[PDB]
C-alpha cells in the first residue's frame, strides 16, 4: 500500500541489505563473529517487533515447541544482520487500548467467518492465552544464554516487555525513546534501529525526531533479502519538499515533519475509517499536502505542536479540500466506468450526482428526518475530531485514554468539519483492560478454547447474559472495491459498564496460575557477568538491600528504575523450558552466576517537546541537485552505493562550513 | 463609472470617517445661487420670467412625501417679492434646526452616503481620466460644500416653477441638448434581509422617485450598505418604472398608488400658494408632525421680522436689480 | 503551433461556424438574403485581414495555381463575398492590408525571404509569390481594385445601406493586425463609445488571440478556418474563436488567493499575455530554455502564481513594465533552466530509443554542467571572459528593450521605427539580473519608403519586383551595399532537428548605407512610381442611402468644409474627415481587373451614388487598460464542471452556442446579496 509509494515517489530511502555469507572474512576463511565490523553499518541500538515474527504468514510448524526453535534461529538471523553494541529492546503486544479493540474485533470477527465458510493456533497470538506465557518465558531463557555464550555480547543490555506489560507493541518502543530524550545526560548520536512490518513505523520514526533512524524490513516484492529505510534520508527530502517560500513565520523541518505525518493520519490508519473522499491507493496524501502548502502561508502558525491541535488552523486546511471532492466523486466513477470497458474493449448514493449528502446519511442510517440527520452528522464532527486528536496524542505523549473509541463505522464528508472551535475535547486516561478482558471482547464464537473455561459459559450460552455482544452471523456492508475487500462487519459495540460487571463474577473460580496471569506488570532487564554495571547492581541491589536504584545514561545508555526481582535466585539455574528437538542446536541450563535479572521501569513522564537535541552531528548528503530536482520540478513520475560509512554521524562539527567561518573561510581559499 | 469588479473588491464606505467636514445648512439652504441664475436670465433676457414658484428640491420632496410620509418638521418663509414667492427655509427656524439636527450614527451615515458617491465617480471624463487619479479617489475626502447643480423650469397645473437641484454626477458626459437624461442620483442604504427592511426599501425608493421625478432625473444607481459600513451589491432603477415596480410586487403583494394622490396633493398645494399670497407678503408655512389633518399658513407682522426675512432670503443685490428690470 | 495547446487547454472556446444557405423559410429555399437573422449570432464590427487571404504559397497542398492577376483577384473577391456573407457585419468594415512595417520587423522576415531565395535556388536542380510586398506595382491594382469592389457592394445590396468600409492599403504606414489595434483604441477614447459593439477579426496569426484580449472589449471573437481536417470545389469549415468565453477561463485560473493587493482580472490579463510573449514571438528570439511545444507558456504561468503572494503588484500596467517585478520572475525561472536542459536531453535520448526498438559548431552540451561559459564562446568565437562578461551584459540590455518595446507596440502603438535586436540569440534565464538599473528610451522616427523597404526585404532572386533602376545597387558586385546580398549565407543549424527551422545568420542592414545610396536615384524615377513611393492617410467610403450621407455632402461638398470632426455616428466610426483632392462625385469607377465572364459579370458603376472621403483617427491618446462603463455581460457558459476540471484537472490532454454571444439582459450587474431585485429573485418565487 503505503510502502510502494514511498518506494516510488522516494527512491534512495530503500537499499538492500549485504548479509556478505557465511565466512564474512575471506582470506582466512573466518566465519561470522559478533566482533567483526558490519558491513551494514554501525549501530548502537535496536528494538524488535516480536509481532512479524510470532506471525509472519508464509501460508508450515503446527505445535507450539516446532517453531520456538525457529523463531529463536530467525530471531538471532536478523540480529547479526544488524549487530547492535548497546540495548536490544524486545516488544510483544499487550493490552491495547479500546479504541484498537474495535478495529480489532472486525479482524477476527472477519476471519471466524472465514472459518465458517471454509467448513461449507492463528489467534492464541493474542495476550492472555497460555501460549504468550510459553513465549513470555521462552525469551527470558534465549536473553540469559546469548549474553553468557557469546563474547560479543559482553557489554549488551536486553530488555523483555512481554504481554503482560500494559500497552501495543510499537507503543512500547516509542514511549522508551521519549523516556530517554527526558534525560539530559542523553547522547544525541545514538543510532537506532527498529524491526517491523506495519507502515506507520516509517511516520513513527520520524515522530522520535532522532536522525539517525533507520528501519529494518525483509523486501516484500522479492536466505530472504531484507531492505534497509534510512530515515535520514527521508529526512533530506522533506526538508526540501516541505521547504516553501514566503512564510509569515520562521521556517521550522521539525515542525514540518510534525504536520507532514499528521496528513498522513486522515488518508489512513488503524483507529478511524477514511474520508469517503480520501483514499491511499488514489495518492489521496499527495492531495493533502499540496492543499496543504498552498493554504500555509495564510496561517499564522502550524497546524500542531508537539502533537496538540490547532483547530482554526486544521477547519482551514480541509476547507479547500471540501471544494475539491465533487471533481474527486466525478473522477472516481468516470474512471471506474472508463475502466468497465477497458477490459470489455480487449446505485443508493450515486456520489457522482449532485446532492449525495442527503442521500448519504439517509441511506447508512435508514432514516431521513432532517433533524435526525444534523444531529447524527454535527455528532460525528465532535467524535472524528476527538479521534484525530486522540491518535495525535497516542503517537507523542503515550496513551491520553484507555476506554475512548469510535463508535460509528463511517466518516463525515470534508465539508461537515465546520465550527471546530466551538468543541470540546476531554479524555480520562483510566486503566488498560486485564488480559481476559481483553481476550473475549476480540476472540470471536470460534476461538474459545484459547479463553479459559469458566468464562466460555458468558461467550457461548444462550442465556448469557451478554450473548447479545457474540452473534454467529452480521451483515457485511460493502461499501468497497468490488464484494468484501474492505466489507465493514457491523457488530453492535461492547457495553463496557454491562460488561465489566459480567466478568467480575467468574474472579473467584479461576485457579492461582490463571490468576498470576490476571495482573498487569513491568518489564524486566538483564546483564551480562562481563558487563559493567553488573557489580554496580549487585553491590547495590544485593548487598546493600536497596529496594530501588535510579540510573542515568550509562555505558550502555539505558535509563530508568531498577528494582531486584524476588523472583529471581542467584544461586538457581534456568532451565529452557521448552522440549529441545532434533536438527536444533542444543540450548544447555546456565546458573544464574553469569547474568543478573532485574526488574525494569522507565523514568517518570513529562511534555515531550519535538525538536532536535544539542550537539547532534549530522551525516553527509546522498541528495545531489538532480536527486532534489527532479523532486522539486519534477512532478510526477514513474544500488551497492555506500553504507559502511554515510550511515552514522560523519565529522565531528555540530554545524557546518559556511559564509565567513574561519575553518569555512580556510576551505574556500585553500582552493583559491 | 463602476465596474462590476470594485463591487466585488468590498469596498469599505467607512474610512476616512474623521475627515468628513460639512458646512451649515443656514447658509447652504439660500436662493442666492438661483437669485444668480434669475439675474442673469433677466440680464440677457430683459423681462422677469413668467415662473412664480422658485424654491429648492428638498422642500418640494417633503411636501410630496406628505401625505404618506408625514414624518417631517418644518417652516417656510413664504415672501412674495415682486409678484414670486421665493419659498426657503425660515432663517431663524435655520438656527434652530441646529440644536435638532444634534449624534454618531446619522453623520455615520451621511458619511457612508458620501464615500460611494465619491467612489463611484470620477471629476473627469473616463478616456482622459489618467490613471493616477483613478487610483486616488479612495485616498480624498469627503467635502459636503462644492455641489454642482441646476435650475429645473417644471410645470404644475397653470404654474411654472423654478427648482434648484444638487446632481450627483452625469452618466457618461454631459449632453448639451437634453442634460436631464443622462444625470445620475446617488443613494445607498442597508442590504435588504426580510420583509421590513423591503418595505423600508420601498418608503426610500418613494421619495428618491418623488425628489428625481420633481427633478426629471431619469437613473438611480441605488447602493447597498452592509451593517459595518461597507458596500456589497448596487443595482439600477428608472424614474418611470419606479410606481409599476412598486405596486406590481410579487413578494407580499398587498391599498392604492400613492403617486397620483401625492402630484394632485402637490398641485393642490400649489394653487393654495399662488391663490392665498397677493403680493408682497412674507408668511410663514409650518406643518407640526402631530398635527396629520391640516397646513398651517400664518402670515407674520410688525414690519421687523418680516424685513429681516425678506434681507435674509433675498440680498439687495437682487432688489437693486429688479429697480432697472422695471426700468 | 500554440493554436493546439489553446484547442486541447481550452476546448469550449472552438466552435464550428454555421454556414447554412438556402434556408428553406416559409418552405422555399431561397437564397439567404444578407438583412437575414444571423445564426451564428448579431455582429456590430468585422475587421478583415487582406494578408490573410493574399498568398498563393500559403495553400499549396491543392492546385489553385494564380497565373494571372484577373483570375486571383476574383477570387479574392469571391472569397471576400463569402466570408463577409457568413459574418454578416451590421456597422463598418475594415479593411488591413500590411504597410510598411516597423525596423524591427523586416529583419524577422529577410530571414524568411533569403530562405524562399536559398531553397529556391536548390530547387532548380508557378507565380511570383514574393510579389505581395508594399511597394509592388500588384498593390497598386489591387489597392484601386478592392475600392471598386467596396463601391459596387454598397450601390447593389440592400442591405449594405448602413454599412461604412474603411480602407486603409499598404501605402499606409504600419504593420496590418497593428493598424486594428490602433483604430480601436481611438474609438475607445471617445466618450461617447457603445460599450456593448460586438466585434470579430478574420486571421491566419496566432498573435491575433493574445491582441483581442489587449483591446479589452468582452465582446470580441476571431474568424478561423477549421485547420484540423483541411491537410486531407466543396466549402472550407471555418471555426469561431469566442475571446469572450476565453475570458471566462483566465478569470478562473488567474484568481490567486490570498494577495495583499486587490484582485484584478483585467490587470491580470496583461500580465498574462506578458507572459505569452516570452514564450514565442516574431520581434525578438526565444529564450534558450523555452520551447511552446515544450508547453512552456505553462511554465510560466507557474512560476508567475507562485511569485504574486510575495509581490506587491503586478509585472505591467498598461503596457509599462516594472522591471523589479520582472527581475523576480526571471530569476525565479533560472534554477529551472538547469533541469529542462538534462530533462529535455535525456527525453529525446529516451525517444530516440523507441525508434531504435522500431528500427557555430554546436557541442555546447546544455544539458552539461558549466554550459553557460561554453555557450558565449561556441557562438561568438572569443574565450576571454572579460569579452563574454561585456558581451553578454549588453546584449541583455538590448532584450530588455525588446521585451518593452513589443509590449508597448500591442498597448500604445509602436513606440519606436528605429529599434532593432541587434543580436541572432537571447541570453539565459541567469543572466537577466540588475534590471532595475538599467535605463530604456525609444524615439519615434520616420517610416521608410516603400521601395526603400523593398530592398531591405527582397532577396538577389527577385529583382524584377523592385524597380528597374535599383537593380544596379542591388544585384551588381559594384554597389556599395553588395555586401548586404549574398548569394549564400552561413544556415546555422543550431542542433535543430530540420533545416528548415535553423538561424539563416546574415549581416544587419547599417541604415545610412542602405538609404543614402537611394536618395541618389530618386531624381530619375518615373512619377508613376513616385506616386507608388509615398505613404499616404487611410480612405472612408460611405453609401448614398446612409444616414450621414447627407451630413458630408453638406459640409464637403456644399460649405467647402476641409476637416469635420466627425465624432460618433449611425455606424460607430468617429475621427476626422477630408475631401480627396479635387476629386467630384460625377466621373465613373472603372474596373481594372477586365473581367473575363469566368466568375459572375461585376457591372460597372459611376461615381453618383456612393461618396469616398480621406479619414483620419481620433488624436493620439495615452490608452488605459479596463473595461468601459454600463458593459453588459453575456450569458456564462461555463456551468462548474470546466470550472473544476480546469482548477484540478492539472492535464486533460485527452451544436454552436450563438445564445451565449452578444451582450444578454440589460443590467449592468449582477443580482446578488441584498439588492431588493435579487431578493425577488430568490424569495419571491420561494413564497
Redesign the interface.
Known sequence: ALFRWLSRKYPKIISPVIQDEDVDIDGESRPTRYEDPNPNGELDNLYLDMNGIVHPCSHVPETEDEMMLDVFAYTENVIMMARPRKVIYIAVDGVAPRAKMNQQRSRRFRSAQDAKDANEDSNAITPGTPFMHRLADSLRYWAAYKLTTDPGWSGIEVIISDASVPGEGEHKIMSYVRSLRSSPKHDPNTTHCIYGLAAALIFLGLATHEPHFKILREDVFAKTPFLWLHLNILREYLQIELNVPGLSFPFDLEKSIDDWVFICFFCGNDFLPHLPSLDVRDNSITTLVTIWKQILPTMKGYLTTDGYLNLPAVERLLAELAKKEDYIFRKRYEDEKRSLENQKRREEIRLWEPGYRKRYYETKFHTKDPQKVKKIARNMVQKYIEGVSWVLLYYYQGCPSWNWYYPYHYAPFAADFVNLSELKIEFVEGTPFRPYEQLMSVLPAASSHNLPDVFRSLMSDANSEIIDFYPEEFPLDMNGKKVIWQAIPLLPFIDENRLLKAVQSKYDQLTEDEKFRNTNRSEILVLGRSHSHYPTLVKELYEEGKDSYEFQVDSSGVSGVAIKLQSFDRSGVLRLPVKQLEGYRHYPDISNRDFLMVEFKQLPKSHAKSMILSGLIPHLRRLTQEDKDSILYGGTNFENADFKQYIGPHGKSQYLPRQGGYKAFIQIHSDE | ?????D?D?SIDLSVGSKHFLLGDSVELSKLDPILLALKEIEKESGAKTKDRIITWRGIMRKLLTLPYDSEEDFVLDVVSFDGQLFIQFNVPYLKSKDVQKQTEFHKKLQFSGYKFEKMATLPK????C??KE?DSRAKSKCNNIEQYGAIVRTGISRIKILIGGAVACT???YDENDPLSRYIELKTTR???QYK??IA?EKKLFRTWAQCFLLGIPKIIYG?RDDNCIL?????FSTNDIPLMVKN???NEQKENCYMSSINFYGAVVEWLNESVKDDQVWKLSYAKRNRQYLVLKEVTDENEKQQIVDSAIPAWFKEWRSELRN
Open positions: 463609472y463602476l465596474p462590476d469588479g463591487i473588491n471624463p473616463w478616456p482622459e489618467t490613471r483613478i452618466a457618461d458626459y442590504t435588504i434581509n427592511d423591503m426599501f447597498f456589497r451589491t448596487v443595482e439600477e410586487n410579487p413578494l
